[PDB]
């Protein structure tokens, strides 16, 4: 489906905060005893509305709430950390969870270079 922003307003600029898992630390700053406190682990960025991405995200998160709330109602886990990993597994099962019939629509295998190598032989 396409994303139709139906909000009264849109802040088209997204001033965001997050963390970095990879961040190669300078010297000994990775040691918890020497490193930053909880308040100082964040990085910041600014993203504008190119391709209308920012206003779509505001509309996407709004439309996500119903399904998300129904998922939380039906789980007994107090804190849910597994949604994105379960989506990665589902991405693989959608493609590789059955026998892969080559040239079929539900199989992502390309026999292009293999079909040309056989023609050359």
């Amino acid at each position: 489906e396409a994303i139709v922003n139906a909000q009264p307003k849109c802040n088209p600029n997204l001033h965001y905060w997050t963390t970095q898992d990879e961040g190669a630390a300078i010297g000994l700053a990775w040691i918890p005893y020497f490193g930053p406190a909880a308040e100082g682990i964040y990085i910041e960025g600014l993203m504008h509305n190119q391709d209308g991405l920012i206003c779509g995200l505001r509309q996407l998160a709004n439309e996500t709430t119903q399904a998300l709330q129904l998922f939380l109602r039906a789980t007994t886990e107090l804190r849910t950390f597994s949604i994105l990993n379960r989506k990665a597994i589902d991405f693989l099962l959608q493609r590789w969870g059955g026998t892969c019939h080559i040239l079929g629509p539900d199989c992502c295998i390309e026999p292009a270079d293999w079909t040309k190598n056989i023609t050359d032989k």
Binding site: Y16, L57, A61, L72, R79, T80, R95, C108
Partner: protein
């Protein structure tokens, strides 16, 4: 199913579960991101009177918490200390590992009393209370939060100052809630929905520098004389 956002044809879209796009490449779990976006950004009124009307107490519904990895700098956040008239607390202590929202230009700290007819306080519109990378369905006591909603994404493969504004409240969470903005422990201003954060801080400074603070041991309360754009774009005083 929970929707997942993806970029096709220079536009964000919801991925069709019943459709398989082999051209879509997911090469590592790092391409998947959960993001939190603030209700502010959609244009909701952020003043304390309007914001508290969106919350309510309910029993029989277990609280739920979901993780999110990146968030938005908020202009307005909220921090509640609400007791019943008998002094019992209305909101639960913050669970271990739940901290306040990390970027707030203004923290509206509200203290007061209300009936609190319910075990937990929920968002009446179904939104979340956003904390430090955790989103909750309920409000925790004395913990700073922004109102927001969560999205999930497939990325395509490749200073900070905060100011606390204190309010006293009576009849919290009812039809007739009264709010006072706090200058010091003995000087308050009758609160209106139209008062912005910037106006409250200039009202506080002008009161401090005009000597309009209480110089007795009793309460002084002022009422400002009566004399459409979002944030990104007794006695009287006339």
């Amino acid at each position: 199913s929970i929707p997942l956002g993806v970029i096709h044809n220079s536009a964000l879209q919801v991925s069709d579960v019943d459709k398989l796009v082999c051209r879509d490449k997911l090469s590592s779990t790092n391409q998947l991101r959960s993001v939190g976006l603030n209700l502010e950004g959609n244009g909701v009124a952020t003043d304390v009177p309007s914001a508290t009307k969106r919350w309510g107490f309910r029993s029989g519904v277990p609280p739920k918490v979901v993780n999110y990895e990146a968030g938005e700098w908020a202009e307005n956040c909220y921090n509640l200390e609400i007791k019943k008239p008998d002094g019992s607390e209305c909101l639960p202590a913050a669970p271990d590992g739940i901290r306040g929202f990390p970027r707030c230009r203004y923290v509206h700290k509200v203290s007061g009393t209300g009936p609190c007819a319910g075990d937990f306080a929920f968002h009446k519109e179904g939104a979340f209370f956003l904390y430090d990378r955790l989103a909750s369905t309920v409000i925790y006591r004395g913990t700073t939060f922004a109102e927001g909603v969560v999205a999930f994404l497939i990325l395509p493969q490749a200073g900070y100052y905060s100011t606390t504004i204190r309010y006293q409240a009576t009849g919290f969470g009812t039809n007739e809630t009264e709010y006072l903005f706090e200058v010091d422990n003995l000087t308050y201003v009758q609160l209106e929905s139209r008062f912005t954060p910037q106006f409250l801080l200039q009202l506080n400074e002008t009161i401090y520098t005009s000597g309009k603070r209480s110089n007795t041991t009793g309460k002084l309360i002022w009422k400002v004389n009566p004399e459409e754009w979002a944030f990104w774009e007794x006695x009287x005083x006339x």
